[PDB]
Each structure stands twice: as structure tokens, then as C-alpha cells.
Amino acid sequence: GGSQWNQVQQLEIKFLEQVDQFYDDNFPMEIRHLLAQWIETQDWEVASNNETMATILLQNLLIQLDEQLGRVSKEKNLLLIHNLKRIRKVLQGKFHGNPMHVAVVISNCLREERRILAAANMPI
Amino acid sequence: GGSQWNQVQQLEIKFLEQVDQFYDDNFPMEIRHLLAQWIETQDWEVASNNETMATILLQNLLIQLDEQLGRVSKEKNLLLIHNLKRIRKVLQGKFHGNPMHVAVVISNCLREERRILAAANMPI
């Protein structure tokens, strides 16, 4: 009973090179990983053509990001606290700029994983 | 028998906010953490005024970074593999540009930690 991210984690590490360009300022892997289940729950595809929806999703992403920051702070995970706060600043800027584009990037990233998962060689 | 990094990890999490500006493209926290002992072994302070030394240190940092990449690949730590490869590209550019400046940044970062460690309130 795993997420799409959990399925990606079971693939041979060589696939990872194919997804590099699907992550940029609009969507970093820290978010993909720490919030995998939340990310996989939203309809990014519909939000990518709807201003109001995209804004709501980004607002909620920011709220989840803060919860993550509280958790890694309690865990004293220095690297993640440091990286997450820088990500938060970038995402705040996306909120004031173009939330729909963030939805586009996440939507592409998730579909790319579906493509890769289907392509992966697996024995019957 | 811990490193300066290990000592920083024992501080109250609020200190972390003070070191943010000491990390930039020339030196990311991923390197500070994964290679804490190696970082703490080099004489960055002397390399910051010596071209040849700074170049040698950066070449060796790149060699250690590759070993780290082999380890996280074996461990299948997606986030770190992804982040480390992007860091490697940036550092390669620093090697062709200004290695002395990388030494300056690391030297400042380590001294800043010494300042913070000394300032930290600790009961006798």
C-alpha cells in the first residue's frame, strides 16, 4: 500500500537521471518526497487550467510545507530545515506570481513518473 | 569524539537561522553535512590566499563528492542523488572559475560556527 513515489523508489537508480529536468524552482524534490502523499492527492492537471484552483492548491502546499518545517525542526534535521526555508521563500514568490505554472510543472512531473513506471522492466 | 558539525547539531535549532547566508553556490549544506569530517580537515584559511592550494582542495572536494554520490546511489537516496549531481555541476563551474573564493566561503562558514558554538548558552 504505497504511493507512486514509493513505487519510483523501487526502480533501478538509473531512472533518476530522466526526471532531473522535471524539477525546477516551481517544484523541488524535497517537496515531492516529504509530501509525496499530499502531492499525489491533488488534481494538478485541472488546476493547471484554473487560476482559482491553482492558487488554492499552492496556498495549501505552503500550509503543508510549514507542518513539514515544524517536524524537521523537532527532529533537528539541519539540512532539511535549511533547504525547506529557502524553498518556502521561492514558493511564496510563485504564489504572488503564477500559481498555474506550478500546477503545470507538478502535473508534468507526476505524468512523467507514470510513463517511467510503465516503461520499467519487471519480470512476470 | 565528534566533529564541529556534530557539536552544531547539539545546539538549539534556533541558531540555524544565523548561518543561512554562509551557504551559497560556492558551498551548500549538503556538502557541509555529508563531508563534515573531510571539510574540517582542510586548511581553507590558508587556501583562501593561495591559488594552487585552493585548486587542489576543490579538486579533492570533487573527488569526495563522487564517493558520496556512489554511496547515496547504492542507498537509493533519491533526494540526495538528485541534489548532489546538481551541486557537482555548480562546483565544476567554480573549479573553472575561482577556487579561492570557494575556500573563502568555507573558511568563513567554519569560523562562524566556532563563534556560534562559543556563544551558545550551556550550563556548567
From Swiss-Prot, chains A, B:
Q: Where in the cell is it found?
A: Cytoplasm; Nucleus
Source organism superkingdom: Eukaryota
Where are the membrane-spanning stretches?
Answer: none
Q: What happens when the gene is disrupted?
A: STAT4-deficient mice are grossly indistinguishable from wild-type mice. However, the development of T-helper 1 cells in response to either IL12 or Listeria monocytogenes is strongly impaired. In addition, mice are acutely sensitive to methicillin-resistant Staphylococcus aureus (MRSA) infection.
* Tissue expr: Expression is restricted to testis, thymus, and spleen.
PTM comment: the record says: Tyrosine phosphorylated upon IL12 and IFN-alpha activation, but not by IFN-gamma in T-lymphocytes and NK cells. Serine phosphorylation is required for maximal transcriptional activity but not for DNA binding. However this serine phosphorylation is not required for cell proliferation although critical for IFN-gamma production.
What protein family is recorded? Belongs to the transcription factor STAT family.
Quaternary assembly: Forms a homodimer or a heterodimer with a related family member. Interacts with ARL2BP. Interacts with STAT1. Interacts with JUN; this complex efficiently interacts with the AP-1-related sequence of the IFN-gamma promoter.
Job of this protein? Transcriptional regulator mainly expressed in hematopoietic cells that plays a critical role in cellular growth, differentiation and immune response. Plays a key role in the differentiation of T-helper 1 cells and the production of interferon-gamma. Also participates in multiple neutrophil functions including chemotaxis and production of the neutrophil extracellular traps. After IL12 binding to its receptor IL12RB2, STAT4 interacts with the intracellular domain of IL12RB2 and becomes tyrosine phosphorylated.
**Annotated protein name in UniProt:** Signal transducer and activator of transcription 4
Lineage, opening ranks: Eukaryota, Metazoa, Chordata, Craniata, Vertebrata
